């Protein structure tokens, strides 16, 4: 019944189907075979050295399998005809697919490429262009080949006795068509064949996702022990909601899903808002509307105050635009596919969306609301051709008295001026001429002629870039030349650091400007449920009416000059207190228009993908005889080149459209005057543009309809506004006039905010893709498991799947099934390093690198199939660990000796016990600067060489610096060659480090002297005693598996800040701020320098020791006081090694905080500050395992008896982890510390 016994039979059966002649034993750590293909056999034929048997050996091992080398069997990969056992179905979706195909008739500039038919022996001017696009657009790179994904569902559908539709349309693709593509399993980036259609990998990636989405639901529906979902009155089947959706996209899935995701997201926002009894989850927090310290009460219901408000004309107009958006996506697919049926289950819900209720306390309404958010992720990573279009500023709106353009431009001048003043109070100033060159390392140049040169030329220019996104179409990224970005670095620096803090008060009548705007970081620091608690409590409040407008194509109306001049007017007038000092000869007012000049951002030439027209061939050669030029600009491989646009537009249209065309030089590609995403002021400026617009929003509402709609909060983030207001009348006519004056303010600014995008609702909040509904948490999961952003190279396979399980902690936290999230990792633990070995071996002997023989030079590489239960063997024993009973608990080596002593885990961890100390090891790979360096570095580099070299060869730790500059020089050649060149070196290392591997007995629970881990708690016993309250805590995030619902029930959501971040990580906060310190060195780096010397003779010998790290000099103050603090304050000198409590579900719980100790911990008082953390980090995993089993909630107490022999073993083992014997003569630390002097008298 356990996941380790039932699930391991399935992943073994996948290997029993994939490599069909493999005898697999579970109790072996990893079995080894090999296989080869003749793509490399043909190559050394061409160099002269012919081979003995060309394909005779291939005949020997196809189906007889009778040959095996060195005793190691040789087994072939399965063909495509057999991955579904030759099954066939009716599959009405598949016959919709095959009539929705079209050859040689597509528009060559288009966003998401349609169904092109592959006909063999066709032309090399169209079909090579279509093969050029699909090689860039349709790529399924990642960590797992897509072939074994299709075999995995074939094995998984049999056990659940349920057939997914993604396999039904795939099983008809195997009997009529042989092989869709040839993905090489070594690199996963090459797809060199399409047999019937160019969009065949998109056909599978939307099918290998379609199958998991209904295995996720059907497993979850039995966990809630309900038959089907329940819209507010009627029964509804969730799989029919997806099968009605999968048929509609299947003509053109990247285009259909991008226009159908808008009514699906809008439906979940406005569901339970119009019903008269409304059930909320009563919350309580601070007086500010943005306070995050929230306390939850039980569920209750209340009468709706806004019942008659939804009879208005704002919602009735907004609903028919969304019912149109359903119908336009339908009519585009009713003709391109043969189907006459569409969406019959969803259309019955949108006709009455407001008045139907939604109750979160029943699970049959929370799964359905989560499912519709997770519908849209089948066609992940929309990769799209973009075209190069210009400014076209005749459409740019000129400032007028009748328009608000000049009033917007004078508002935003007073906001950059105000951000500079309020950064002066937080000690954020401009950079100085002294540290101008030192402060240039914040990015990864400066010449008086290179700074005066322009870029509005065909000869020299700027070059665009592009990077992908999860569901959206591919957004651009701007690459600016580094000569003219440093003038933007010097003047936008006290704005990047100022809005970097997380705290803020958002009141409109407050005078300050920093709290009301906020720019987050790359990763969400903390959880998502934890730091979005201000969104939850305002959907649970009867008197908050939130307004959140949306700007469609924000840059096209940021293109206007009104925010360009008004920003630069406020830059110049605020540099007036800095008007005397000169930057390298010239003033500061001259250099701001070197980063915001005319040939910098006003009018610059940009080169993207080119314009191109589809024409005939006979008229092409009659004109191309005069203009055959190249060399100025390049042309894609399908297209035929000409010189200019003016000879390319005269022959433009053709009924046959045989051959393509492209202008190389005479194009005049693109000129843009718009705030770039690449500048240092991207997220600072456009969020201030929402502030200048949003302040004009409150004025016209207050001047046309006064007394109504008072404003209480103002949150401005990237391309979003969020007003927390309250409405003072439930009127049908008056509210219709207030909602009209909001759109008239945006339209008279220049933008066009859609009435279907604008949100004016009482009981629903969306903010930065976090949906809050009626006091609870409705989650989406757009993160996916098949595709990826770029091709991923598995360099640290110990640390890759340890990082991949973090993105599987989040998935089950949004409602994915817990055990289905175990089966995915147990599949994904065997198929990672299978093709990372160079040459073949013979077992129980040496490992052959060179062969020089015709037999073994055919069997090139090996296969390494690890056991599926390598997920559960803990770290430090050459395999990564996650616990089977709960995914959020880190399996460590002290947890392995505990989890076998518990009676409720003798059945689950019975097959785990036989594979420990059985697994193979892990593929664990590991001039200008004379100006841009601190004077700690320049004095150390301009030294006499007789003094500079003694810090390099004999002595010195020196983890950052000139050799790290060489590592920074190794980081810039890293991307192609240095990753590949050392990959030839680690493989010769890994064969020796595998042949010298002996599976060693006598596991140890301990660490070195100068560090300690969570395994320190095994010195003492632990007695589960006491009794606590069995009160079920209340929490907003419903929709969890029972392995996660019971951890949040017994242990509530946290209410304070966690204390377990030790003072070793308090100085990491000092090293987190500096980006010249953040990406390079940290606490494990800086404590090794304290390991080289403690207890010096003067503090003036103390401040200077980290200038010898040659990074900074200011933060040696924080290392002056804290070492003086640890000379005053007690400390255990050791560090803390851990890998636990970092995933975003553990940060939400009330574990590892100061209020967690006071009820769940009882420890002896003779323990230091970093020893009580090692007990508490042990104590967190014990209680989370105590709750996820069903064991009774007790108070964990570590006990020290009076057994005078056992009191001696503790005083012997606490001593050696505090002070080292031999290393005292290395550090020359004094033993007269107060903490280490107590150890004589602690336990006695």
């Amino acid at each position: 019944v356990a996941i380790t016994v039932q699930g391991a039979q399935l992943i073994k059966r996948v290997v029993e189907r994939f490599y069909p002649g493999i005898a697999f034993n579970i109790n072996e750590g990893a079995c080894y075979i090999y296989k080869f293909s003749d793509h490399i056999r043909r190559i050394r034929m061409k160099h002269g050295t012919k081979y003995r048997r060309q394909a005779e050996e291939i005949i020997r091992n196809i189906s007889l399998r009778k040959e095996r080398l060195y005793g190691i069997p040789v087994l072939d990969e399965v063909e495509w005809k057999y991955v579904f056992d030759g099954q066939t179905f009716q599959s009405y979706a598949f016959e919709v697919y095959v009539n929705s195909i079209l050859p040689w008739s597509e528009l060559d500039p288009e966003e998401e490429f349609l169904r092109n038919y592959r006909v063999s022996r066709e032309m090399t001017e169209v079909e090579k262009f279509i093969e050029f696009r699909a090689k860039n657009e349709m790529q399924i790179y990642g960590d797992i080949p897509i072939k074994v994904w299709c075999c995995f569902i074939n094995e998984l559908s049999a056990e659940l006795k349920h057939v997914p539709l993604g396999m039904q349309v795939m099983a008809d693709f195997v009997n009529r068509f042989d092989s869709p593509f040839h993905q090489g399993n070594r690199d996963l980036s090459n797809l060199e064949d399409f047999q019937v259609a160019y969009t065949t990998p998109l056909l599978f990636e939307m099918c290998c996702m379609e199958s998991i989405l209904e295995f996720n639901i059907k497993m979850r529906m039995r966990e809630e022990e309900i038959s089907a979902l329940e819209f507010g009155d009627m029964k509804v089947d969730p799989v029919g909601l997806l099968r009605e959706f999968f048929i509609l996209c299947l003509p053109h899935p990247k285009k259909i899903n991008n226009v159908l995701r808008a009514p699906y997201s809008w439906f979940v926002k406005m569901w339970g808002v119009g019903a008269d009894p409304i059930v909320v989850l009563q919350s309580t927090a601070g007086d500010d509307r943005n306070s995050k310290d929230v306390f939850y009460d039980k569920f209750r219901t209340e009468p709706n105050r806004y019942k008659a408000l939804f009879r208005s004309s704002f919602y009735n107009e907004s609903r028919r635009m969304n019912e149109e958006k359903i119908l336009e996506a339908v009519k585009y697919s009713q003709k391109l596919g043969s189907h006459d049926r569409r969406l019959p289950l969803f259309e019955k819900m949108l006709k009455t969306v407001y008045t139907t209720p939604f109750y979160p306390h029943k699970s049959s309404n929370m799964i359905l609301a989560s499912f519709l958010l997770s519908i849209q992720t089948i066609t992940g990573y929309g990769r799209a051709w973009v075209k190069n279009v210009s400014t076209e500023f005749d459409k740019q709106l000129k400032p007028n008295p009748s328009n608000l353009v000049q009033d917007v431009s004078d508002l935003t001048r007073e906001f950059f001026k105000q951000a500079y003043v309020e950064a002066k109070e937080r000690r954020e100033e401009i950079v100085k001429p002294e540290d101008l060159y030192t402060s240039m390392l914040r990015l990864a140049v400066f010449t008086d002629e290179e700074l005066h040169k322009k870029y509005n030329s065909v000869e020299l220019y700027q070059t665009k870039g592009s990077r992908d996104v999860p569901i959206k179409a591919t957004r651009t990224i701007y690459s600016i030349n580094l000569s003219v970005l440093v003038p933007q670095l010097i003047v936008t620096l006290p704005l990047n650091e100022y809005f970097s803090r997380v705290g803020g008060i958002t009141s409109p009548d407050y005078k300050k400007i920093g709290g009301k705007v906020i720019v987050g970081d790359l990763e969400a620091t903390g959880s998502r449920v934890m730091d979005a608690a201000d969104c939850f409590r305002n959907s649970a409040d009867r008197d908050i009416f939130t307004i959140a407008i949306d700007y469609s194509e924000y840059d096209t109306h940021l293109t206007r000059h009104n925010f360009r001049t008004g920003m630069l007017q406020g830059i110049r007038e605020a540099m007036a207190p800095y008007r005397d000092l000169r930057y390298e000869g010239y003033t500061l007012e001259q250099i701001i228009d070197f980063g915001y000049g005319e040939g910098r951002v006003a009018n610059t030439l940009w080169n993207g993908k080119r314009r191109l027209f589809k024409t005939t061939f006979d008229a092409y050669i009659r004109l191309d005889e005069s203009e055959r030029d190249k060399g100025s600009f390049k042309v894609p491989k399908g297209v035929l080149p000409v010189s200019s646009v003016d000879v390319a537009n005269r022959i433009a249209v053709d009924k046959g459209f045989d051959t393509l065309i492209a202008a190389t030089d005479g194009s005049d590609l693109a000129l843009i005057d718009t705030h770039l995403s690449g500048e240092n002021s991207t997220l600072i400026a456009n969020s201030m543009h929402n502030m200048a617009i949003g302040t004009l929003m409150q004025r016209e509402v207050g001047r046309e309809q006064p007394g109504v709609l008072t404003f209480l909060s103002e949150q401005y983030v990237g391309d979003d506004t969020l007003f927390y207001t309250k409405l003072h009348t439930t009127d049908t006519k008056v509210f219709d006039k207030v909602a009209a004056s909001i759109f008239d303010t945006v339209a008279k600014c220049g933008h066009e905010a859609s009435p279907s995008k604008t949100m004016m609702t009482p009981y629903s909040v969306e903010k930065t893709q976090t949906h809050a509904k009626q006091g609870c948490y409705v989650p989406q999961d757009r993160m996916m498991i098949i595709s990826s952003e770029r091709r991923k190279d598995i360099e640290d396979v110990q640390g890759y799947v340890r990082s991949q399980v973090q993105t599987m902690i989040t998935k089950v936290s949004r409602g994915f099934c817990h055990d289905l999230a175990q089966l995915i990792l147990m599949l994904k633990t065997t198929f990672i390093g299978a093709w990372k070995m160079k040459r073949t071996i013979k077992e129980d002997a040496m490992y052959r690198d060179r062969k020089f023989d015709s037999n073994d030079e055919d069997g090139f590489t090996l296969i390494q199939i690890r056991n599926p239960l390598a997920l559960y063997v803990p770290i430090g024993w050459n395999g990564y660990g996650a616990h089977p009973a709960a995914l959020n608990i880190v399996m460590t080596e002290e947890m392995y000796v505990d989890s076998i002593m518990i009676s409720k885990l003798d059945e689950i961890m019975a097959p785990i016990r036989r594979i420990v100390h059985d697994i193979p090891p892990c593929w664990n790979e590991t001039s200008f600067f004379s100006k841009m360096a601190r004077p700690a570095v320049q004095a150390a580099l301009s030294d006499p060489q007789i003094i500079n070299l003694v810090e390099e060869l004999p002595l010195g730790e020196f983890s950052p610096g000139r050799i790290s500059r060489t590592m920074m020089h190794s980081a810039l050649l890293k991307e192609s060659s240095a990753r590949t060149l050392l990959s030839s070196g680690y493989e010769l290392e890994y064969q020796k480090a595998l042949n010298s591997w002996i599976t060693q007995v006598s596991m140890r629970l301990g660490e070195e002297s100068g560090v300690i881990s969570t395994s320190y708690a095994k010195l003492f016993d632990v007695y589960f005693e006491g009794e606590l309250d069995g009160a079920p805590h209340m929490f907003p995030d419903q929709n969890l598996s029972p392995q996660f619902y019971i951890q949040k029930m017994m242990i509530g959501p946290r209410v304070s800040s966690r204390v377990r971040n030790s003072y070793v990580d308090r100085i990491d906060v000092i090293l987190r701020k500096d980006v010249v310190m953040r990406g390079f060195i940290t606490a494990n780096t800086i404590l090794n320098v304290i390991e080289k010397l403690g207890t010096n003779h003067s503090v003036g010998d103390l401040v200077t020791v980290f200038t010898l790290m040659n990074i900074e000099t200011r933060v040696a103050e924080e290392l002056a006081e804290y070492m003086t603090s640890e000379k005053i304050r007690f400390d255990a000198l050791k560090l803390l090694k851990k890998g636990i409590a970092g995933d975003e579900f553990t940060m939400s719980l009330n574990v590892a905080t100061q209020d967690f100790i006071d009820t769940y911990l009882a420890y002896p008082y003779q323990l230091t500050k970093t020893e009580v953390d090692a007990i508490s980090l042990y104590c967190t995993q014990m209680i989370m395992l105590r709750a996820a089993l069903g064991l009774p909630k007790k108070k964990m107490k570590i006990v020290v008896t009076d057994d005078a022999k056992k009191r001696y073993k503790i005083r012997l083992q606490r001593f050696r982890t505090h002070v080292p014997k031999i290393k005292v003569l290395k550090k020359l630390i004094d033993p007269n510390r107060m903490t280490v002097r107590n150890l004589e008298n602690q336990f006695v």
């Binding site: 207890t1095 003779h1097 004094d1230 007269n1232 510390r1233 107060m1234």
Partner: protein
């Protein structure tokens, strides 16, 4: 040159921790190769007195 016993300063000069002074700093320091040459200048002037 013969140093004294290292316990003759440990029981009486650095005997009380949580206090430092002029003497308690000088005990934790070893002479360089040139300060040890100036000790040789002290002991030459004590043998040839005036």
């Amino acid at each position: 040159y013969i140093a004294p016993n290292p316990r003759i300063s440990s029981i009486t000069l650095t005997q009380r921790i949580t206090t430092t002074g002029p003497f308690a700093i000088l005990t934790g320091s070893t002479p360089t190769a040139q300060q040890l040459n100036d000790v040789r200048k002290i002991y030459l002037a004590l043998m040839f007195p005036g």
